């Protein structure tokens, strides 16, 4: 499934749950300056960590982050309980 | 200072040191001597 | 200063440092407490993925559903036939794991696996190192083996 | 490693020797019916 | 003089100079390799060609005569049967241990 | 607190052992970052390939000469000039056309 | 402590000097060091247990007025020698006799030094594996001291 | 972890800028901390062929300190390549003309002898005292323990302690001292 | 020839590539690779050091519990040893006997 706006869909689903807006910030940092640098990026909810998300840049760690939430409130994480391909029935 | 690799002394004046790594035996009264190992 | 007693110097103690570990009776309460809180997240089903170091053939394999590994011997199963691997040396989730000593019971861990199909290796050369080797002393070394998939690790609330 | 610990403890100093490791079957059949002794 | 046992030997080794064990475990812990050629003999006549395969041999003067010709070669433990000799019901439940012990059962489950 | 690793950076250890003792049970739940702890993000100033250009600025020849390109390169990324030379139509024409991929 | 007092009239007077601490933790002790239980537990870097031994301006004070045994009037002078060149004793430096300034070169940073850095010479040819050439480290007076590691140290690096 | 697949290829590959502080530190204790870093031997992830090795930072080269008489016995030797040119300098002449050689000589040596060392060697920044530049300071991610700990110099040490440690012996009031 | 010859070395550099990454492992819980290993089995738990990669590589809070249970095997230990006498050992150094 392709979403551009993940983002943006993450506001709207939290309002849907009566959740405030997430606030982004930098939980961790590496080589920022350099042409190889990695930046994490986690959405704070009420400062508690909704989820996190790795990025090249702020902008891409921030919509990244988005995509961990919504699969978090989706629940398809991969680490989910796998489907029952295996029930006789 | 002739280099031996027995230092005596040759007077009772004579005296013991240990100078830059090496022992040297120096008499006041005669600088004959006077010698280093 | 009490007999025995040592000035505070360099070479008096030694660099490490020694630690006090807690008393075993309360330890005990607190691991029957994690015992019971493993349980209820076993009972109540609180996991998502598990995994499973299974000792097969001569080899311990990290398995998980959905899984597939090569096995380098035939196993007079036919194709199809699932089966269950009876040492399992651990058994983790996201949130907890369990470690055999040496190998978990029976009733904590059951693991299920299919027989996909059974083949042979691709031919292996073998040429010893040997005066006048030549070109045609070799030979074509060829195994057989099977596949397998892991269809399900499932666990049951009897810790 | 650790295989004189082993033997003070009356185990065998490889672990791929006398115990319930190596000797216990390595798996069964799905409807529990045990499956044919290992060659080994 | 050196098979000669003292006092403090029987209290380190925990056997009894009375009473006298019966049969031998001995192993092969080094190799024939560059040992004089009548060495070499006396390991293949007491068997001992793989190494660390036990080989139960009897406490005797003749085969003590050869075992001490290859004394730097093997190691010797006397073999021990906490629960008896095996019987032909329990003959094929036996299982040496690395203590020495030939127990009659095998069950592989928690001794509890 | 039992554990003898410290349970601030990855995880809370919880080790216990079962009432027979043949099992050890393990509780690690995952700690999440302090808020406190965090920075916020720096708005006022992008992707990288704009983060590159800017790096690569073209200023003096228009494009430069392959060593005082290559030496440019070569700063950036903290590696030799000798990984960014070309090869030949030899080594070129060995290589697959399409390598196998695992997931 | 007899200190001179100028003035021409010059005068020595005795002043109160600091008392040793009671009840060292081994009674009896013959020398010293072992009556307070530090025979072979004390090395360079303690310069606290030195610094009771040495004159103001960095010398050694004679065995009597010390009392310390031969086989530790001999360990501590050793020690003191390396505590000095390591720089951990600021406050002892040479008496500079007309105002005299430091060489005024900057001071390498160096321990567990044998000898005086003046009277070693560079060692042009290393040697090989087997026949390597050793750089001493440590002095081997301080062999009997505890050892906290699985072999013994390495005197010669 | 639920993270997209090149995010988490990219994660897990990323490099660290690493501190290290030379100051009372033995090169070689620094070189065996050094060394380990460049290549990524400290990564689960490590194999030769990822090129997955990470920047450290050294300061305080100067500062740097031998044991024993390695200051006058230590000697570097190095030859231009024509008759004659065969140069032998002791470590304390090399520090004094080139503060940074020391430290990096000592990297240089433990690395693996192969082409990748000279990769690797481009990672490793020296600076002879704290002096550092600005871009270099965000890029830092974290500092690493000093291998040696230093010893106190008498000064340093508070007079309350002096107070615990207990007097050896006490010299008598009839000494000049 | 070679081909032949490498057969049997990729078995055993494949080994030193875990050790190296079971040392790396280790080091970030601040165990050294002897402590780890021996400990882990001095706890009766038998795991090869191909898993134990696979472990730190892909379950990285599963090995913190690992070098936690290591760990304080290895500081029971030292205690033992330091506490001479007949002393109830630690919950974990006790060791289950198979018959
Ligand atoms: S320290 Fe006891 S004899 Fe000197
Ligand atoms: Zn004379």
Same mark, same amino acid.
């Given at each position: 499934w392709t979403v551009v706006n993940p983002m943006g869909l993450l506001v709207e689903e939290l309002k849907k749950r009566n959740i405030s807006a997430p606030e982004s910030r930098l939980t961790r940092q590496s080589?920022? +300056? +350099?042409?190889?640098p990695l930046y994490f990026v986690g959405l704070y909810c009420d400062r508690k960590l909704i989820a996190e998300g790795p990025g090249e840049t702020v902008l891409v760690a921030e919509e990244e982050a988005a995509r961990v939430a919504l699969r978090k409130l989706y629940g398809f994480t991969e680490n989910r309980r796998p489907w029952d391909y295996s029930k006789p029935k | 200072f002739k280099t031996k690799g027995v230092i005596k002394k040759r007077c009772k004046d004579c005296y013991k040191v240990k100078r830059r790594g090496r022992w040297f035996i120096l008499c006041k009264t005669n600088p004959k001597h006077k010698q280093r190992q | 200063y009490p007999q025995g007693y040592v000035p505070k110097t360099s070479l008096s103690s030694p660099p490490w440092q020694e630690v006090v570990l807690p008393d075993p009776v309360e330890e005990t309460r607190h691991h029957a407490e994690v015992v019971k809180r493993v349980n209820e997240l076993i009972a109540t089903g609180q996991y998502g993925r598990l995994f499973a170091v299974v000792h097969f053939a001569s080899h311990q394999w990290k398995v998980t559903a959905e899984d597939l590994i090569l096995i380098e011997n035939e196993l007079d199963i036919k194709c199809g036939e699932r089966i269950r691997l009876e040492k399992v040396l651990l058994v983790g989730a996201d949130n907890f794991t369990l470690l055999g000593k040496p190998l978990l019971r029976k009733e904590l861990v059951r693991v299920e696996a299919t027989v996909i199909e059974k083949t042979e290796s691709w031919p292996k050369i073998n040429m010893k190192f040997r005066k006048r080797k030549n070109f045609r002393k070799k030979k074509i070394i060829v195994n057989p083996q099977t596949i397998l998939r892991i269809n399900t690790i499932e666990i049951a609330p009897r810790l | 490693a650790g295989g004189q610990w082993r033997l003070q403890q009356g185990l065998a100093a490889n672990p791929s020797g006398y115990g319930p490791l190596t000797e216990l079957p390595d798996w069964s059949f799905a409807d529990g019916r045990p499956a044919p002794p290992m060659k080994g | 003089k050196v098979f000669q046992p003292k006092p403090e030997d029987h209290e380190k080794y925990g056997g009894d100079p009375q009473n006298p064990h019966k049969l031998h475990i001995v192993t092969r812990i080094r190799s024939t390799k560059r040992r004089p050629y009548w060495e070499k003999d006396t390991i293949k006549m007491l068997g001992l060609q793989k190494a660390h395969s036990p080989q139960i041999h009897k406490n005797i003067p003749s085969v003590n005569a050869k075992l001490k010709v290859v004394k730097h070669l093997i190691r010797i433990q006397p073999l021990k049967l906490p629960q008896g000799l095996p019987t032909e019901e329990t003959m094929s439940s036996t299982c040496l241990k690395s203590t020495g012990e030939l127990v009659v059962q095998w069950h592989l489950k928690p001794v509890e | 607190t039992y554990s003898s690793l410290p349970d601030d950076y990855n995880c809370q250890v919880d080790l216990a052992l079962t009432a027979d003792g043949r099992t050890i049970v393990c509780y690690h739940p995952s700690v999440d970052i302090p808020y406190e702890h965090t920075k916020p993000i720096p708005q006022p100033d992008e992707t990288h390939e704009q983060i590159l250009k800017a790096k690569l600025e073209v200023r003096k020849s228009k494009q430069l000469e392959q060593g005082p390109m290559i030496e440019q390169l070569s700063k950036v990324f903290y590696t030799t000039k000798h990984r960014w030379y070309p090869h030949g139509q030899y080594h070129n024409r060995r290589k697959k056309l399409n390598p196998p991929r695992d997931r | 402590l007899r200190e001179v007092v100028k003035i021409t009239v010059i005068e020595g007077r005795i002043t109160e000097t600091p008392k040793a601490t009671p009840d060292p933790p081994n009674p009896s002790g013959q020398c010293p060091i072992c009556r307070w239980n530090l025979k072979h537990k004390y090395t360079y870097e303690d310069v606290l247990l030195l610094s009771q031994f040495i004159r103001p301006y960095g010398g050694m004070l004679p065995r009597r007025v010390t009392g310390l045994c031969r086989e530790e009037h001999r360990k501590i002078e050793e020690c003191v020698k390396m505590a000095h060149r390591a720089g951990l004793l600021p406050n002892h430096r040479p008496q500079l006799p007309e105002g005299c300034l430091p060489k005024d070169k900057p001071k390498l940073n160096r321990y567990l030094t044998r000898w005086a850095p003046k009277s070693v010479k560079p060692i042009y040819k290393k040697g090989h594996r087997w026949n390597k050439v050793g750089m001493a480290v440590g002095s081997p007076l301080l062999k009997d001291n505890v050892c906290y590691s699985r072999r013994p140290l390495k005197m010669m690096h | 972890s639920s993270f997209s697949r090149a995010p988490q290829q990219w994660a897990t590959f990323a490099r660290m800028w690493y501190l290290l502080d030379g100051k009372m530190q033995p090169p070689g204790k620094l070189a065996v901390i050094a060394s380990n870093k460049l290549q990524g031997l400290n990564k689960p992830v490590y194999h030769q062929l990822s090129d997955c090795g990470d920047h450290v930072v050294i300061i305080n080269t100067r500062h740097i300190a031998f044991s024993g008489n390695k200051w006058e016995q230590k000697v570097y030797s190095s030859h231009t390549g024509y008759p004659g040119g065969f140069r032998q300098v002791t470590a304390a002449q090399l520090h004094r003309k080139d503060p940074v050689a020391i430290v990096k000589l000592a990297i240089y040596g433990m690395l693996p002898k192969n082409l990748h060392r000279r990769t690797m060697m481009q990672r490793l920044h020296l600076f002879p005292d704290e002096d550092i530049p600005e871009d270099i300071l965000k890029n830092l991610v974290e500092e690493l323990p000093q291998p040696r700990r230093v010893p106190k110099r008498l000064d340093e040490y508070t007079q309350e302690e002096i107070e615990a440690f207990p007097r050896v012996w006490t010299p008598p009031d009839d000494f000049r001292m | 020839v070679k081909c032949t010859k490498a057969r049997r070395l990729k078995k055993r550099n494949l080994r030193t590539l875990w050790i190296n990454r079971i040392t790396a492992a280790s080091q970030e819980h601040g165990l050294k690779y002897p402590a780890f290993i021996v400990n882990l089995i001095k706890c009766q738990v038998e795991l090869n050091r191909k898993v134990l990669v696979d472990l730190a590589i892909y379950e990285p809070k599963t090995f913190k519990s690992l070098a936690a249970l290591a760990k304080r095997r290895q500081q029971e230990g030292f205690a033992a040893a330091l506490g001479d006498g007949k002393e109830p050992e630690g919950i974990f150094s006790r060791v289950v006997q198979y018959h």
């Amino acid at each position: 499934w392709t979403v551009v706006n993940p983002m943006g869909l993450l506001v709207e689903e939290l309002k849907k749950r009566n959740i405030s807006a997430p606030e982004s910030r930098l939980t961790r940092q590496s080589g920022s +300056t +350099t042409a190889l640098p990695l930046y994490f990026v986690g959405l704070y909810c009420d400062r508690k960590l909704i989820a996190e998300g790795p990025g090249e840049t702020v902008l891409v760690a921030e919509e990244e982050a988005a995509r961990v939430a919504l699969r978090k409130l989706y629940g398809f994480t991969e680490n989910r309980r796998p489907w029952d391909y295996s029930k006789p029935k | 200072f002739k280099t031996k690799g027995v230092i005596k002394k040759r007077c009772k004046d004579c005296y013991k040191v240990k100078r830059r790594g090496r022992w040297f035996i120096l008499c006041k009264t005669n600088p004959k001597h006077k010698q280093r190992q | 200063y009490p007999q025995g007693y040592v000035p505070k110097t360099s070479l008096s103690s030694p660099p490490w440092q020694e630690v006090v570990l807690p008393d075993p009776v309360e330890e005990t309460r607190h691991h029957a407490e994690v015992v019971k809180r493993v349980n209820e997240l076993i009972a109540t089903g609180q996991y998502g993925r598990l995994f499973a170091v299974v000792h097969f053939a001569s080899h311990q394999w990290k398995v998980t559903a959905e899984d597939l590994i090569l096995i380098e011997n035939e196993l007079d199963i036919k194709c199809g036939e699932r089966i269950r691997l009876e040492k399992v040396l651990l058994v983790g989730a996201d949130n907890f794991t369990l470690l055999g000593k040496p190998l978990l019971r029976k009733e904590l861990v059951r693991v299920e696996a299919t027989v996909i199909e059974k083949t042979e290796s691709w031919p292996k050369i073998n040429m010893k190192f040997r005066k006048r080797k030549n070109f045609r002393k070799k030979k074509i070394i060829v195994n057989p083996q099977t596949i397998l998939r892991i269809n399900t690790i499932e666990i049951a609330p009897r810790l | 490693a650790g295989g004189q610990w082993r033997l003070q403890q009356g185990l065998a100093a490889n672990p791929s020797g006398y115990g319930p490791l190596t000797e216990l079957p390595d798996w069964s059949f799905a409807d529990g019916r045990p499956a044919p002794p290992m060659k080994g | 003089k050196v098979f000669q046992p003292k006092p403090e030997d029987h209290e380190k080794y925990g056997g009894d100079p009375q009473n006298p064990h019966k049969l031998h475990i001995v192993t092969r812990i080094r190799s024939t390799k560059r040992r004089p050629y009548w060495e070499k003999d006396t390991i293949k006549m007491l068997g001992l060609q793989k190494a660390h395969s036990p080989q139960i041999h009897k406490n005797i003067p003749s085969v003590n005569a050869k075992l001490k010709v290859v004394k730097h070669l093997i190691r010797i433990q006397p073999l021990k049967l906490p629960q008896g000799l095996p019987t032909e019901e329990t003959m094929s439940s036996t299982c040496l241990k690395s203590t020495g012990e030939l127990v009659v059962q095998w069950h592989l489950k928690p001794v509890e | 607190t039992y554990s003898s690793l410290p349970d601030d950076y990855n995880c809370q250890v919880d080790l216990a052992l079962t009432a027979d003792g043949r099992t050890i049970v393990c509780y690690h739940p995952s700690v999440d970052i302090p808020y406190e702890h965090t920075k916020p993000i720096p708005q006022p100033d992008e992707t990288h390939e704009q983060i590159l250009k800017a790096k690569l600025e073209v200023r003096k020849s228009k494009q430069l000469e392959q060593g005082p390109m290559i030496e440019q390169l070569s700063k950036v990324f903290y590696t030799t000039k000798h990984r960014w030379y070309p090869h030949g139509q030899y080594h070129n024409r060995r290589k697959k056309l399409n390598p196998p991929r695992d997931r | 402590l007899r200190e001179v007092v100028k003035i021409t009239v010059i005068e020595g007077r005795i002043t109160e000097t600091p008392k040793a601490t009671p009840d060292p933790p081994n009674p009896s002790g013959q020398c010293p060091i072992c009556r307070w239980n530090l025979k072979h537990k004390y090395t360079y870097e303690d310069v606290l247990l030195l610094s009771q031994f040495i004159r103001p301006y960095g010398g050694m004070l004679p065995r009597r007025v010390t009392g310390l045994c031969r086989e530790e009037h001999r360990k501590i002078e050793e020690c003191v020698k390396m505590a000095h060149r390591a720089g951990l004793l600021p406050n002892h430096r040479p008496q500079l006799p007309e105002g005299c300034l430091p060489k005024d070169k900057p001071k390498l940073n160096r321990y567990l030094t044998r000898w005086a850095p003046k009277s070693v010479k560079p060692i042009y040819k290393k040697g090989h594996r087997w026949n390597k050439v050793g750089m001493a480290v440590g002095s081997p007076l301080l062999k009997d001291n505890v050892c906290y590691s699985r072999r013994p140290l390495k005197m010669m690096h | 972890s639920s993270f997209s697949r090149a995010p988490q290829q990219w994660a897990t590959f990323a490099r660290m800028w690493y501190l290290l502080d030379g100051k009372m530190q033995p090169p070689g204790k620094l070189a065996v901390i050094a060394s380990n870093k460049l290549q990524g031997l400290n990564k689960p992830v490590y194999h030769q062929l990822s090129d997955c090795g990470d920047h450290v930072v050294i300061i305080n080269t100067r500062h740097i300190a031998f044991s024993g008489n390695k200051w006058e016995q230590k000697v570097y030797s190095s030859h231009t390549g024509y008759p004659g040119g065969f140069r032998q300098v002791t470590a304390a002449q090399l520090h004094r003309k080139d503060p940074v050689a020391i430290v990096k000589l000592a990297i240089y040596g433990m690395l693996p002898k192969n082409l990748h060392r000279r990769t690797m060697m481009q990672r490793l920044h020296l600076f002879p005292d704290e002096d550092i530049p600005e871009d270099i300071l965000k890029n830092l991610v974290e500092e690493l323990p000093q291998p040696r700990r230093v010893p106190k110099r008498l000064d340093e040490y508070t007079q309350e302690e002096i107070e615990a440690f207990p007097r050896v012996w006490t010299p008598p009031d009839d000494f000049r001292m | 020839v070679k081909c032949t010859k490498a057969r049997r070395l990729k078995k055993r550099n494949l080994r030193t590539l875990w050790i190296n990454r079971i040392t790396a492992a280790s080091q970030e819980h601040g165990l050294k690779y002897p402590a780890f290993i021996v400990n882990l089995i001095k706890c009766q738990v038998e795991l090869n050091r191909k898993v134990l990669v696979d472990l730190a590589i892909y379950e990285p809070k599963t090995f913190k519990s690992l070098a936690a249970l290591a760990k304080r095997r290895q500081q029971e230990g030292f205690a033992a040893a330091l506490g001479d006498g007949k002393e109830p050992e630690g919950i974990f150094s006790r060791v289950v006997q198979y018959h």
